[PDB]
Structure formats: structure tokens, C-alpha cells
Design a protein around this ligand. Sequence first.
Ligand SMILES: [Mg+2]
Ligand SMILES: [Zn+2]
Ligand SMILES: [Zn+2]
Lengths: 1335, 73, 99
Amino acid sequence: EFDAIKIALASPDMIRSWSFGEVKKPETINYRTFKPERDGLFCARIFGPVKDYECLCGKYKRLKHRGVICEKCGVEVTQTKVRRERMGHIELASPTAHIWFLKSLPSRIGLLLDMPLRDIERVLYFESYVVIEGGMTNLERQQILTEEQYLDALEEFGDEFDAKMGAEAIQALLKSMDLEQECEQLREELNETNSETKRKKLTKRIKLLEAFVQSGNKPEWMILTVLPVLPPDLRPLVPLDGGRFATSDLNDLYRRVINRNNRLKRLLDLAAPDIIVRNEKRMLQEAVDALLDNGRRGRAITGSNKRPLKSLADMIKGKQGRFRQNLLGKRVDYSGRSVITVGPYLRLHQCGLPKKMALELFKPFIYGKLELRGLATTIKAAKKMVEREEAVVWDILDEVIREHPVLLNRAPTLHRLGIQAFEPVLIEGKAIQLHPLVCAAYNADFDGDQMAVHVPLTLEAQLEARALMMSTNNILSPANGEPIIVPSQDVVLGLYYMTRDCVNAKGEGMVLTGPKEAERLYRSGLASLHARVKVRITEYEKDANGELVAKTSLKDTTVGRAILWMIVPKGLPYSIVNQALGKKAISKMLNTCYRILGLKPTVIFADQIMYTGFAYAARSGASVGIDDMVIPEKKHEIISEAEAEVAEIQEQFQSGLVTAGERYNKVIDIWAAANDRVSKAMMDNLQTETVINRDGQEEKQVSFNSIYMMADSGARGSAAQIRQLAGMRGLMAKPDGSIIETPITANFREGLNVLQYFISTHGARKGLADTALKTANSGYLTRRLVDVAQDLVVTEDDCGTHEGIMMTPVIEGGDVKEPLRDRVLGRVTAEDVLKPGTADILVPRNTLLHEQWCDLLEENSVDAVKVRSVVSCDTDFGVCAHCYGRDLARGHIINKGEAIGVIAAQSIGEPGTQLTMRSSIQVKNKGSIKLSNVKSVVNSSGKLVITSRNTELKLIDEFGRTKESYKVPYGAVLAKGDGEQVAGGETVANWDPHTMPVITEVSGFVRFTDMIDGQTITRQTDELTGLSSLVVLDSAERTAGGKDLRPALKIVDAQGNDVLIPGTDMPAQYFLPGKAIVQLEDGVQISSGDTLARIPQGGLPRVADLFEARRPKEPAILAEISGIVSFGKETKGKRRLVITPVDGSDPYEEMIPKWRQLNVFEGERVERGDVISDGPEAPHDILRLRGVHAVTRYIVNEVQDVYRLQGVKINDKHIEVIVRQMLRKATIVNAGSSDFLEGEQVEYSRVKIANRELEANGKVGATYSRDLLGITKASLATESFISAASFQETTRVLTEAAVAGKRDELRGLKENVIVGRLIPAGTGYAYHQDRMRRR
Amino acid sequence: ARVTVQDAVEKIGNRFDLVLVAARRARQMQVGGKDPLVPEENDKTTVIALREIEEGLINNQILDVRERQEQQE
Amino acid sequence: HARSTGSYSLVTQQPLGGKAQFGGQRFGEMEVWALEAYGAAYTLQEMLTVKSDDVNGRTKMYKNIVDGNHQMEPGMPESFNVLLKEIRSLGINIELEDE
DNA sequence: GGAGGTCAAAAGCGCAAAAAAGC
RNA sequence: GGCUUUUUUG
DNA sequence: GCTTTTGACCTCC
Ligand SMILES: [Mg+2]
Ligand SMILES: [Zn+2]
Ligand SMILES: [Zn+2]
């Protein structure tokens, strides 16, 4: 129907073609009669009729007069819907400047005409003169004038120079400016000028000039001449009760502008003095300005409400605008709302529905079925019998809703599980019944939360719902493989109470034939629900070639476990149902079923579990009473001891022997220890109890106290809450963060005096405030993720590239934070996995990893593997199917046409609600010692001192895997040699944390060479120490003649020669910085690298700042090019540093502040991308120096660090997809054989696709550099201007597209959603393949 | 009646093609003629078609050859 | 409450909102994302065009349902045309292209 | 003379609901 | 049927 | 009011 959407500037010609007449009367209607006013804003002649097929005159009526103009009213007889399309135009008496093109962030007129923006507003608002042609005078053509200058020049030169006023002058000068001549002048100028500030402005100007050259638009069109009028129906005068009428802001502004046009055109006819016309034209300009955009220039037009009126620009942008309120989301029919209520008797794949809601929703379906059966013939008759609620109506409704699935969602719909399909079943009442198991997925509790129902209509919709959105097809979350149907709360307590033996109970110690018999005993009351017995059981195993084999024996279990064994299907072993069966176990057990028995058995088994759990929890009667809170007996006296402790510490403050900090820390530690002791004693007393066994002796068993049962099973609560009930509450915090010295010694079971309760509310208010204000920030963030990633759909099976990223277990030096197993699970190998034995292929290339291949790695103990990743896939406008890896929802390889970008955005944005805004080295485990990226020397004492920055420790296990990694400063002490079988719990490295050393290079003797005393170094024998040492003077006393005197401590041997290091023999003098004290003297022995001087020196906002690629406040600068360190002409306000390559030139320079720390000196060799200062590392530099594969690993690591700190499991696959959408743009370096400017910024995929055939033929490529953009900015800069326009900054994007005459292709997801066509994803993907094949 | 479509989506490549072919078959069943190949148990048109998918006797290839043979009149 | 087919707003032709006005619910933008996350495209296309505002097509939907035939006509949402005219109400020229 | 530093202006800041009033 | 103002729930 | 970003004017080297 339409291939694409084209947007460009307008012309008076096409505006006149659009309109059907001109409007001249500001009045709208009679307001006496209900008839439209002729020639007004609702003119029947201009726009159209009022009643369908009825002209205003009434002479002609009905279809017989269609397409005929009435004689006197002149209104064509046709339908009234044309009132929505026909537009009007207003002939302005004088040209008027358009606001948008003048007042964007970059001014279009401002840069096109090359003037400051301030002057143009002065010219337009008639407050200053302007030259339109200098002529043969002393005035520039584009010169700005004022009154006095021109009045003097009026008689000085006369008609020699030409100057005018207003939008007329602006348009006249704009038309007089040539375009190709300006373009060629810029082309000449850029190749000549050498100044970065000029480069960007000139490049922008030339790009805009070329944009006008190529596009079929002309600059003079920018100034309005004829003003279009919105169609009447879109700005309706709807009548209310009474003679008054409802008027919109559009009508008022249109009336004002048209009335002013009439006034000015009447006043111009009599040739009024120029003073009058200036003000009238200026304030008409203000009126049109307010019409197109209100409040942009200054004070906004306000009505009786004293609030600014809506305008055209106000009706497009913002949440209340057109896009975000009526295109991306719109109200629907066949929907309803209700209150949730639990129902246990429903199966997993169905939900309840009230009768009235079902009838109202499926009324259109009932009408048809009644006609088919012949109960009523006319639709009116059927409607009559529906409202009577006849007996046949319910029967036919039951028949028509047997398998008609319905949709259920709960706002907010955070993740994709928020909408699920169901098969309704009719119930009584007025509430919607829901299955308990899925309540965890919605995050919905039964405290008044409300559901909405929608109904599919077509067969495609019904089948789509049944095969995709049904509940039984959603048991693994897309975020991670963990199940989503985990039983919780009441069911868990029932299962826990089922499977728990007692040391003695009724009917204990007998033998039972089978589980069927065991159930007979429990119901008869002849045996206790849990008493240890011996039962015959039979289990099946699928160990054969997919076949079940039976086996039978006797197992020592309890009655309850035998009862539970009936519902377990055949495959599972018996040992899975023989433990206490808490929350953590039961889910695991359920999960195993899905691993072996497919889907139907596992859903049936989950349903049976829920039934049995509810039943046996109800029959248990587990209740909580006041006596259940067992308060430990020792607790009381323990507090006394703690009191005594502080009774001493305070005395130390009275004697003055301790400071405020010392006492504070002491009392804090003492109270914390007392808290821990009380908690441990309480748990030890509560968790066990004594009961008489069979032989009459006391035996300790796990206690059957209600609170302990509800805590240990994990059904609800944790050890912290049980602490809160019985033991002390613990230390509490002030609002700012300080900890109160006096803790709350009382518990909730007993009383809390007044002030304890008061100080307990400091934390709670903070928690509530943070919870209330986190939902606003977090949800918004999700939006920014969706618009960046909404273009990503899998389109091709294989991309055919070998490039990838290596994957290693992340370690901070302690236990592994994430082992190698889970990070690599479900991906594809970039290269074949090689055995530690050389040249052996463990894993073939291009093979998916799963449980059968991962365990092979564990047995073989492979260190690391390089896997293919989405960030490196090469297919354009899509993602390789293999590169994305294994689909986490189903467990097999992903299939084409699935939307991965939206899935990743939802997955990363959902857990945001669970976030909050506010010297020695010791080994811990046995293992070897291994060092890489290290170079060190052996000191005189016999140990090792390190001089390599990249030294990292390893603890090699029995096989070779790395257990820990540490960073050590240079010049530490290594007590042991590398490769030795070291033991755990033994220190390995030592150094000074508070000082940075000036350690020597090799063994030698220091000779006092080239130090000037009194201006550079002085012998500061400070009396507080009584020690004489060489101290370098500060930077204040020294000056240009003294700062240039660098103290060169040259390390020499006995002969005085330079350092004879392997390969090179440079003189190794050390330029001492300021504040350096030299304790060693001349002739003193120096070890291998001995010291010469010791110089002195987080939540959701963090995630948001990390994704936007914010520049940190203290950027740690890096190295830029490989080469030796070389200082320069320093103390020029800032420092100068140069890097000298081995063979290449060394022209690079950059500014560094003195006051910031410096870590590298002359006698160091620095590689590009090595730190110089300290602090956070900005992403832009990481991309610029270390490449793409470095930045993607940094962002993933930091985000996953935050999430694992808060205990949320999200797969690393989703994080990097967004990163792939951040690296979209790229900057040209050299044009080469291409046709791009060097300063341009274009798409990396576009450059690659365009250059690829160029290199295929006999041409050369174009060099480029991938750039990084924040998600907010990266979303704005996209080809499809519709999606960018809908997202943010509507005014800027529309103007930028219109000026350049850009054209949309309609290939994304959002821009296809807007115009009502099928999205190119999921089921709709097959349709576009058919469509794309035709074209 | 039917609750899950795991076996049917095992029979066909991916779920989306299954949705498309099942929709086409159900449309043929409902709009006119085309007596279903499997006996009905008073079920809607959509599910009865879907069953035929998991019997391995209706798919994109089998359904296509039948219609061209009907249209050759 | 629930709605099958009731009134319609005068400007954008979308159904009203609020229980007192007997209007339908709001298929929110987040719901659009979530329904995009599935492969479900036909249901979203329904929500966008037939049940909301395709005034020429939604009438044909009602007549088809009564006849027993479950089929749609895509059409093109009426709310999008409005915006077109509105952008044309400024100095910006925006138009569709050939088939 | 210009590249760097510092000051000034625009744009955004959950979603669903309901209930009322008032304009 | 649009806007404004609050209040309340999730 | 927060915060960022971008543009524009001053000015130090
Ligand atoms: Mg709730
Ligand atoms: Zn007439
Ligand atoms: Zn690929």
C-alpha cells in the first residue's frame, strides 16, 4: 500500500494545492443558531458539509444529488467524513518567520546565513536595522545596523546601499544567497584552514549546504507565506449543557492570528505611518510564534485558567502528546477489569471468570451462535434474549467458551511473563480466580491487586495465544534458565511437614506392603503421619536406550514419604523424595523431572504437588502462638556482662587514655559480639528438643516448634526475622549513616520502651522512601533500553566469522565469583577447544555447548575458552543465529525471527526494582604459585622484588586451573620462588601502602651527582626526629632557574658506569620529584632495587551512569602509543609528556595537571593503554586505545558486579546485546576511494556494507574508527526518523529530518507498530520475507 | 481437548511456522467444506486442526500439494 | 466492568476510558513491549488496528464474527492519519509513497 | 591568534487506576 | 470529551 | 531542584 514515508519542507504552491479555500472571518458559528458561519473557521463551503449527503442550503438531498454543488451555499453533497481531511489556508499579508527552524539547539537560519542567533531575533522583532545589499558603500552586505547608524547613513549614502526590516528582509537576503558558490568556497576553505574549532563548524555548514543541494528544497521556503489551517473536526466545538460551547486552544489562537492579519491588511491599504506598521507586524509575528509553539521565545499566552494554551508543538511532544498516548499504546475493546482471588481447584492451564464479564465480553460471539441454532432470527431479537439471561443463553455461552483462550496482564508488565494466556472456566461471584502457582511470575499478591482481561478474535490470534502465551509453555524464564513455577509458602510447609521423621510415634517399626497400603493406615488413624518404617517400593529408571526398567526392594522411610511417593512419575529415583524436602530441595526435585520427563509429565507433577501440599498443610493445622517464641534464658545475664564491659570503656574516656573514635569502635565491637552470642544461643535453644524414645531415654531430635518449622523449611522468613523476634534487634543507624552506640536490647515478643521504638523508625522511613522513589527512576531506565534495542531480530543462520571473545572465570583473589561452567553454558565455540595435551581437539568448532559438553570440560579441567559473541557478529541489520547462542526459554538453539533486543531490555530492566540508591597478601587455600606478566629481580637479602606493573598472582591447583589473582605494587617482597608447591594460610608479599618508593634499578653504589644544595635539595635535620637526610625542596622556593635543575640520582657501579641492563645501556639517573627525603647516603650499600625515598600520596544510579557512558569526575588518563617515556617542556601551567616509539615518530602531546598523581617516570617503558594517573577508567578511552573487545568486557563485568552484589541472577548474554547497540556509529578517518568526508559520523554497518564491494573491485577501502555513544544519544541518532521522533526531543528530530529531506524505510519494530502493519518479528517475520521477495 | 503443543512443535521446525500452518488449516476447515481427517469430540476449529499437525499427516508440504490439485479444475 | 462495543472518542476514534463512561482498558506501552517479546505479532496487530480505531475495518470485524467467519482486514489506524494532517498543519511536508 | 576554561540555556524527570471537584 | 487540581490504591 | 549536555563568550598561553 505504501513502501516508505517521505518528509521534506513545504512550498506555498503545495500549501495552496492542499487547501480548498481561504479563511477570513475569525468568528466560528452563529452561537444563536447551530449552523456554521460562512467563510469562517468552520465554513461549509471551504471544508465540507455537516450532515451526510445534505448540503447547507438544503435544496439538494440524498444520494441522487451526490457530487453536485448547491447554487447559493456551494457545498458539495457527499459524506461528512471528508470534514476530517480537507484543509484550509490563510494568506498572510506579510512574510512571517518560522520558529522551529530559527530556535532549535543549532539554529538552521543561524548557521545557514552565518550570523549569531541574537542578531536575527533583533532583526525580526523590528528592534534593529539590517543591510540587504552593501552596494558601492562602506557597509557589509550581511552587516547589522541600528537606528542611529542607518539614519546617519540615510543621508550619507542614500540609495547607494540597500537595507530593510523584518521577515521580508530575511527572505530577500536568503533568496539572494547562492548555494553552489558557497559550497565550493567552503570546499576550498576546509583544505586550507588548520584549526580544530573551525573544522567542526565549517564541516557542519558544508554538510547542511550539500543537504540543501541534493534535496528538492530551497532555503527561501523556510519563511512562511501562506499558513495552513488544521481540518475542522480535529479541533471540535463540542456543545455541553447550556448555550455555552466548548472551545479548544487551536480555535482561539487561529482566531487571534486571522483577526490580526485582517487588521494589518486593512491598515496597510490606507498607508499608515511606518511607526504603526512596525509594531503591528512585530506583534503579528508574536501571534504566529505563539500559534506554532507556545512559550519557546518568552512569556507564553495564557487563558482564563492562567495556564499556557496548547499549541501544535505541544500536541505532538510529551507524554500527553500524540505519539506516546495514542500511537504506541491505545485503548481497546473486548477488555475488562476485576479483583484477583486465589483458587486452588483450578489446573495450571486455566483461570476463572465471572459470568457477567464473560457474557459482556463474548456478546458478539453469542449473537452468531444463536442465529446458527435458530433461536432468534434478527440481531435485535438476539440482543433482547441476551439481556434477559435466558436458560439457553448460559448453555450457548458454555458451548462457545470451551477452548477460547483469554489474556491476563497486570500493570506494570515488567517482563514478558506479565501477559499470559488461559482457558476460562465460568464461576459465580464478581472476582477473577487465578491459579496460585503463577502468582509468583506476575509478582502479584492477593491484597487488592487487579487484573485486566483481553480477548483474541481471529484464528491466527487464538492459535498464537495457545502455542506461545499459554501458561504451560512458560516454565523457564528468559532472563536465566532457572524455573519460574517454583512452589512457595503454604505448599512448601505442607511438604515439609509431610516428610520429617519423629523418634517415636504411633505405629512405628512395622512393615508395609506398598504406598497404596500406607495411605490406608494414615486415614484410619492407626499410624502416625510420620514414623519410621520399612516399605516395599518400586522405581523405574531410563538408564537403557530410552526405556524404563523396574526394580524392587525395601527402603527405610516414613509413612508420609510413602504417601508422597504416589504422585512422583516413573522416571525419578526414590532418593529424591527421602529428605526433609524444604523449599530449596522441592524445586530442584521438580526441575529434575523437566530434565528427564519432558513437559506434560512435569506440569502434571507440579499440579499434583500443589494439590497434595495444600491438602496435607490444611490437615496439619500448623499455627503460631505467643508461647512459640522461645526466649533464651541466658540472654538476660549476657546483657549484664556487656553492660559491665562498657562500664569500663567509658571510664577510659574519663581518664583521657582513649579518644572519641577509640571508645566508639570499642563499644561497637563489644555490642556486635554480644548480639552474635545472643543470636547463637537463641538458635541453639530453639532448634532442638527432647522427647522420650522407645526404650525410655531422652533423645534430641529436630524441634517441631511452629516458628522453627516455618523458618527452616524456607516457606517464609529467615534467620534474621527469628533473631528479631526472640533475641535483640541489634544496632540501628542514624539517617546520615552513623551507628548508634546504644543498641536496642529488647525484642518484639516483649516490650519496647519509647525511645527504642523511636530510633527504630529512622531506618524504616528511609526504606519506605527509597522504595517509593526507586520505581520512578528504574522503570524509566527500562524505556531507554527498549528504544535502543528494539531493532534487533535474528535474521540469518550463520554469519561466517571466526572472531570472538575469550571467557574466563572471574576471580578477585578469593573464591570464584562465577565459575567457568555457567558463563560459557549455552554458547558456541569461536575456535576449537584444545586439550591441555598439545594438538588434541576436545570440542569441534561451531558446536553448541550444553550439559553433555560442559561436564566434559569439568572432567578435563580446561582453563578458558574463546566463544563467539553477538558483539562481533558480522551480518548487517541483524544478528547471526549461532552468535546469539542458545535460547534460554526453550533450551535449544535459537530460531530465526525472534526479537532478542526487546527480550534483553526487559531482562535487564526488570530487576531494577530490587536495587537501592543509598599492605599484606595472605593465601587461603592449598595450591602452587604461578606468575605471568611479571618481571622482577632477586634482592640482596635473597628474596624477590618486582618491577612490573602487570604482575598477577595465581594459585595453581592439582591440575593447573587458576584459583586466585592479586595486584601487587612494584618493589614488594616475595618470600618464595615461582613454581614452588606452596601451602595455604601463608603470607607471600609485603610492601608499604602509605608511601610510594623510589627503589633503585640494580646493584650499585650511589654517587652524589648533579644535586644543587639550597635551591633543589637541603639537609632537613628536623628536631622532631634528630635525623639528617637529603630532602628535595618544594616547588614554591624553586623557580625557572631552580625547577629546571632536576636532582639526578644516577645509579652506578664502583666504576661509575651506567646500568648494564640486558640490551641497552642508558644512564639511569632518577629525577627526584618534590617532597622527597633521601635517607640513604653516599657510599651506603644498595640492594637489588633498594628504596631511595618514600613519597607520601553505587546502585541504580551507578548502572544508569555506566550505560550512558558518563565521563567520570576524575578520569584516569591512559597511555596512547607504544614507546619509551619521554618528558618535555613542563611547568607551562600544565605538564607535557611525549611517547617515543622504537622507529615511529613521536609528535603526540597532551596536557596533565601537576597536582594530580604521577605513576610513571623516565626510566619506564609504557605500552599504549597503561594508566598514568589513578581513578575510574572512562569507557571512551578504553574503546579508543584497547579496542572493542576490551570495552565490552569492562561494562559486562561492572554491571554483573553490581547485580551479584545485590544477589540477582541475569545472564551475561543480555548485557552485551545493548553494548552492540551502543557501538552503532563510527567516524571516518581517511576517505580513500570512498565518498565520505573525514569529519563525518556515519553508521558502522553502512560503512562496512558500502566499502565491502569497493574492496571487491579494483579500489581501496576507507579507514574508520568505531565510536561509543550513550544509549540516550545513540537512540536519537538512527536512520528511521519515526522511531527517534517518538522517543525524545520531538521538535529537534522533525526539524532535522525536514531540513535534510530525509526519507524513512520502515524496517524496524516500533515504526512498523505505529502504522498498523505486521512487525518484522515472530510470526510476522515470514510475511516480510514474502514481501521482500516481491521487491 | 488439548493443553500443550510440545509434541506438535517437535513435529514441525519452529513454533511460528506451526502457527501459520495451523491457522491456514483451521481457516480451510471452518470457512467451507474440508471435513477433518481426525474424528471430532466437539472441539473448536483451531484445536482440531492442531491435532492433525502432531499426527504427522498435515504440514506445509502436504497441505500445499492438496490445494493445487483442487484448483486445477 | 467489561466492554464489548460502546461509544468512541470524537477526535482520535479510540474507545473511551473509565468505568462511568463504559470504556475499555488501555493496552499500555509496556504491554506492547511484552507482547513484542513473544513471537506474537497477530494479536498485537489486532490490538493496534481492528479493535481500536480502524473505523472502516472494525465494522467489518463485527459483521464477520456474527456470520461465524473469524477473519480480519488490516486497514490502517485512523489515529495515524490525524497526526499526518497535524504535521502538515505546520510548515512540514510529510507524505506516503508508491506501492 | 586560538585552543582551553568558564558561564548560560534547553530537555527529561513510572505506570495503571479510580474518586471527586472546577474550567 | 479535553484540560486543571488534588486524594487514594497497587 | 538534579542532572546532563551543548552552545557561546572570555582569556590565558
Ligand atoms: Mg499488591
Ligand atoms: Zn447552497
Ligand atoms: Zn554471526
